[PDB]
Structures are given as structure tokens and as C-alpha cells.
Amino acid sequence: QTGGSFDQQGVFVKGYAMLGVTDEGESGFYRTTFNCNELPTDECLWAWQKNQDIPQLTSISWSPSSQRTEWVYVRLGYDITQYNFFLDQTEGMTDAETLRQRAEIRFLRALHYWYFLDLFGKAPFKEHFSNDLPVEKKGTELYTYIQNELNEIEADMYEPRQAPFGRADKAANWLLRARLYLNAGVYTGQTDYAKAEEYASKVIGSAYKLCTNYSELFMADNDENENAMQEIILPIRQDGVKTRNYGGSTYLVCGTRVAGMPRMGTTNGWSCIFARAAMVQKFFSNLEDVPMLPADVEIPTKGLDTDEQIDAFDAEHGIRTEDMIKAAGDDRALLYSGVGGGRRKIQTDAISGFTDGLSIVKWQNYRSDGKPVSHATYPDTDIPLFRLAEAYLTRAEAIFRQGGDATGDINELRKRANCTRKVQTVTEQELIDEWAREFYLEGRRRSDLVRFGMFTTNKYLWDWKGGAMNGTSVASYYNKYPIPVSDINNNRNMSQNEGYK
Numbered sequence: 001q002t003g004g005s006f007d008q009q010g011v012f013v014k015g016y017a018m019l020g021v022t023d024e025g026e027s028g029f030y031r032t033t034f035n036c037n038e039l040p041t042d043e044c045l046w047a048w049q050k051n052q053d054i055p056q057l058t059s060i061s062w063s064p065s066s067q068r069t070e071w072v073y074v075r076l077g078y079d080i081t082q083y084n085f086f087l088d089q090t091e092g093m094t095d096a097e098t099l100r101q102r103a104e105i106r107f108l109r110a111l112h113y114w115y116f117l118d119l120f121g122k123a124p125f126k127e128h129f130s131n132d133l134p135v136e137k138k139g140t141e142l143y144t145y146i147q148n149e150l151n152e153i154e155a156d157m158y159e160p161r162q163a164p165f166g167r168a169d170k171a172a173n174w175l176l177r178a179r180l181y182l183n184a185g186v187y188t189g190q191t192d193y194a195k196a197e198e199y200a201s202k203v204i205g206s207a208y209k210l211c212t213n214y215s216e217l218f219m220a221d222n223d224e225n226e227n228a229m230q231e232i233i234l235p236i237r238q239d240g241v242k243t244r245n246y247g248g249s250t251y252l253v254c255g256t257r258v259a260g261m262p263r264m265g266t267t268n269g270w271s272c273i274f275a276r277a278a279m280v281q282k283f284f285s286n287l288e289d290v291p292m293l294p295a296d297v298e299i300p301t302k303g304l305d306t307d308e309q310i311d312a313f314d315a316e317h318g319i320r321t322e323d324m325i326k327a328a329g330d331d332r333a334l335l336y337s338g339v340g341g342g343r344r345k346i347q348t349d350a351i352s353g354f355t356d357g358l359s360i361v362k363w364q365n366y367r368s369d370g371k372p373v374s375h376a377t378y379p380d381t382d383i384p385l386f387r388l389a390e391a392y393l394t395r396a397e398a399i400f401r402q403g404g405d406a407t408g409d410i411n412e413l414r415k416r417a418n419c420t421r422k423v424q425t426v427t428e429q430e431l432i433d434e435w436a437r438e439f440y441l442e443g444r445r446r447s448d449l450v451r452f453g454m455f456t457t458n459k460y461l462w463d464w465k466g467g468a469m470n471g472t473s474v475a476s477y478y479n480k481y482p483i484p485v486s487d488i489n490n491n492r493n494m495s496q497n498e499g500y501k
């Protein structure tokens, strides 16, 4: 529908909706990008390796026929066509409302192009909605286009924290540019840490502030709690009754839980996503310090049916998540090694099930204020896609790369997390580890690993990397996903990424 039937307001809203709503539950914007940036990393593992294309993503051994690569590629492209459609239909309109809408739609399109750039190093490009085949825009050109888009639309965007919650303001714009500049070395071959630092400072200097209780950023009321909202620069709205997405917060909550775990926050635990040993090591350098149930202690088959019973048993063996946090001396150590759901392992010699690694209870469907959530199954928890904390890590890394002292920005995050250990000296290792501690399971890991030259190389080997128990390297061409063979066959304008067949 166009012209008189074009529901501008409605299409505008749908533009944002594509971020959090949609099997069809496997192809959402969040799940596809999340998996491509998480499943192959040191942060987590998908427990059901029999699922199509899972071993590939898990071991960084996919090919151009990868179904999950096609899903994210096609999803990013579809979203952009919808944005191009909105921009074409509102082209020439000069009223203030439309100008703001167009600025935000261009922001969203820019965000999508970043994903193409970060994941594939290029993108099937189209500035408009039409039947013409997209043309290839790669590396530096794509990078330049995204930066220019963000630069041009800034003036029309909302002042920091003045936009209706869920919409992008100037800070979201600056944060994305800071992200682009930080990764400029990867996308253009020429770093630009000074600009990364500059834009990160603009975000830090805005009205946004850090949430004083880390866990609250990932709870059911993170859209009705100032403590959390003051830090969330761009949330993907999710609601238990109105906004459901099997690949949204439902995926982050249900997918990381299994029956028996205390405080599941949902009636359905999928037992899919769990932490790799390397993720746990981010909080415990010596994995021997990780609170664990002794191997010689049996788990009763009776008397462990309720949360209260499970907690008591975990308490006796010092394995409640609160005990995990205390031992780690870090509020972000939201892991679970308790008996709820069965005996957990930290590292496994074979990926056989959900209990082969500690559970990640970072995301929750419980309100910090204790009030009821809207649904017993689907979470109300919003996905804080953009958080002020990214500005601190981005500036810290940029400062470090430029030879400066980044202890301040790092300790700002460690202070917020009530860390017992403060950083005295910043190293590349501390930085990449802090990126994991702060943003694990938020869909960006791979990108940071590639930038640190640690995604495919021997520079950093984590458990099950490359398909080996103790980790092994893979070809460097794997730092970029391949263009789906389906698009290669349909669009002669697109060229396959180097290395792939």
C-alpha cells in the first residue's frame, strides 16, 4: 500500500518492530545476528548439536550453504528493504514529524548495514525500494556510507534521553559511530581510535548514566525502572503478552533455563544455551576457584522438587548463584552451577547436553521491584541492545590503543559491578576479557574477537573453538561469514568472500 493508503505512522512503528518481532522463530533479527556473534565464540554453546547448521556455527566450520548464515543475511536485507520503502514513500516531505521519522529509519538502516559490514565485510546494497538487483558495496565504501548516513541524520534526532522509550536518539547515533570507528581498522584497514574515543565521550557526556545494579539491566522491569533505563540507549521492546518473539528475550530467558533450576521466571526451560569453560574463566582465572558440587556428593532423586528445596541444597554446597557471585567478587558473574536441573560441568570432553557447562542466568523474567510480570511463559524483559557501558569499553580500548591509560574507564564498569579486583594496568587480554564480562550473551562477542585478532587464530584458544576440546585455530577467511550461496546464484552482482568455495 502506497500513496493515500500508505500508513506512514504504522510503517514507521513497524520499522522498529522488525528488531524485536517476527521456523519463523529462528529467523528474527535478534536471534540470527545473536547466533552468528555468539555460538562460535568463547561465551556459549548450543546444547543440541543435532540442530541443522549448529556444529558449523559452533566450530567455525560453516560454508556458503550455511542455513543460519542465509537467515541472518536475508533478514538484514529484508529489514533494509522495508526501511528503503518508508524513505521512498516519505521522500520530499519536510514536516518536522516526518524528518524525525526519516532520521530514525535511516539510523535503523545504518545499524543494519553495520551488521552486514561486520558480519560479511560487504552488503547487497540498495538506497531505494525497487525490483532492481542490489549492487555490492564493500569494505571502505560501505563503512564510509554508514558513517555519512549517521552524520547526516544526527541533527534531526532526539536529544539524549528525550525520545520516547524504544526510539533512537542522538546518543544511539554517536554510540554506533563510536562502534564503527573502533572497528575501522577491520573494515577499512586503517584504524581511527581517536574518533572512537571522541564519539564514546559524547555518549558518556550525555544524560545517560550507568545502572547501579547490573542485573537490573536484564530484568522484567527494565522498561519501568529508572536505574536501568538511564543506561539503556536503545532497547528492543519485548512484552510477555503483546510483543512475543521466540528469538527475542524469550530466547535469552527460556533458552538458558531447564526444569529444576530455581527462579526460572518461565514455565518453559529450553535448555539450549550454556557457558563454555572459557566464559566462566572470565570471572575465575583459576577454574578451580569456581564453586562446584563435589563429584562424590550424590544429587537426591527425591526432596528437590521446589525452588526452596533446591536453594537449600545449593546453599549447603555453596553453589547458589549468589554464592557464585560472592566467589567471583563480581556482580556480573550471573552463572549457575547448582543442582537444579542436574549435575553441571564447567568444561566437557564432548558436547552432549545442556548440563555440560554452567548455566547463564544473566537474563531474567523477574522485576527488580518484585511486582508481577505480564505472562507466566513469555518474558517482559527488554533487550538493551545499546548500553552506555559500551561507550566506556569502547573509549577504554581506544585510549589503550593510543598508548593512554584506560584503567579509569575499565574500573568505572568494575566499580559498578562491585568488583573486588580493580585493574591496575590495562592489557589487551584484560580488555577483551572485560568485553566478555560486561557484554556476554548480548550478541556482539565475535565482532570484538575479530577486532582483537582472536576469532580464528591461535592468539586465543577457548574450549571447543574450531571443533577441538581445548580449542584449535581455523582459516583466517572465517573472520567474515560467506555470502549465502543462494544469493550468489540469484545476484551476479555479489561476489563470494575470499577463502570460501
Ligand SMILES: OC[C@H]1O[C@@H]2O[C@H]3[C@H](O)[C@@H](O)[C@@H](O[C@H]4[C@H](O)[C@@H](O)[C@@H](O[C@H]5[C@H](O)[C@@H](O)[C@@H](O[C@H]6[C@H](O)[C@@H](O)[C@@H](O[C@H]7[C@H](O)[C@@H](O)[C@@H](O[C@H]8[C@H](O)[C@@H](O)[C@@H](O[C@H]1[C@H](O)[C@H]2O)O[C@@H]8CO)O[C@@H]7CO)O[C@@H]6CO)O[C@@H]5CO)O[C@@H]4CO)O[C@@H]3CO
Residues within 6 Å of the ligand: 023, 024, 025, 026, 048, 050, 051, 246, 268, 269, 270, 271, 272
Ligand atoms: O530442549 C528442547 C529443544 O530446544 C530447542 O528448541 C527450541 C527452539 O530452538 C526455539 O525456537 C523454540 O521453538 C518454538 C518454535 O519455533 C515454535 O514453532 C513453537 O513450537 C511448536 C511446534 O511448531 C509444534 O509443532 C509443537 O511441537 C511438537 C513437535 O512438533 C512434536 O515433534 C513433539 O515434540 C517432541 C519430539 O518429537 C521429541 O523428539 C522430543 O524432542 C526432543 C528433541 O528431539 C531434542 O532435539 C530436544 O529439542 C530441543 C531442540 O533441539 C532445540 O532446537 O529436546 C526434546 C526433548 O524435550 O520431545 C518433544 C516433546 O514431546 O511435540 C511437540 C509439542 O507439541 O509445539 C510447539 C509449541 O510448543 O514454539 C516453540 C517454543 O515452545 O523453543 C524450542 C524449545 O521448545
Ligand SMILES: [Ca+2]
Residues within 6 Å of the ligand: 224
Ligand atoms: Ca507495567
Ligand SMILES: [Ca+2]
Residues within 6 Å of the ligand: 220, 223, 237, 238, 239, 380, 381, 382
Ligand atoms: Ca518490556
